[PDB]
Design a protein around this ligand. Structure first.
Ligand code: DIF
Length: 121
């Protein structure tokens, strides 16, 4: 659930989901359209796509359980949705951590009209 994802984000990046990644680029936080502005934005695009593979699940609200083995993220067994949701978020966190070096504040609160074009998952 959104509640777990943000905590995962924070642990991973030292940054707070809101407002650091809640309105970043064209896909972080609301997704929809356009060309991902950068690596961080790309993580969100993939992440939206990931959630997209689970039409019959509820990513924002279904809670899952996970643990850290030394500093690794390990999703604990739950319902199938729960397991695939977790794998989706885990990927996004690692991705964020992997591009923190190019995170740019000029993409915070990015305006909608500056996101043109569809991109397929
Ligand atoms: O992919 C992301 O960076 C995050 C993301 C994607 C889809 C929907 C919500 C969020 N984030 C989000 C979070 Cl992480 C907390 C509170 C409110 C919102 Cl809208």
């Amino acid at each position: 659930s959104l509640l777990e994802f943000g905590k995962m984000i924070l642990e991973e990046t030292g940054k707070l989901a809101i407002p650091s990644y809640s309105s970043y680029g064209c896909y972080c936080g609301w997704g929809g359209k356009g060309t991902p502005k950068d690596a961080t934005d790309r993580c969100c695009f993939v992440h939206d796509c990931c959630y997209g593979n689970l039409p019959d699940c509820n990513p924002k609200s279904d809670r899952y359980k996970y643990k850290r083995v030394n500093g690794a993220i390990v999703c604990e067994k739950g319902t199938s949705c729960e397991n695939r949701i977790c794998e989706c978020d885990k990927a996004a966190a690692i991705c964020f951590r992997q591009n923190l070096n190019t995170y740019s504040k000029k993409y915070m609160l990015y305006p909608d009209f500056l996101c043109k074009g569809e991109l397929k998952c």
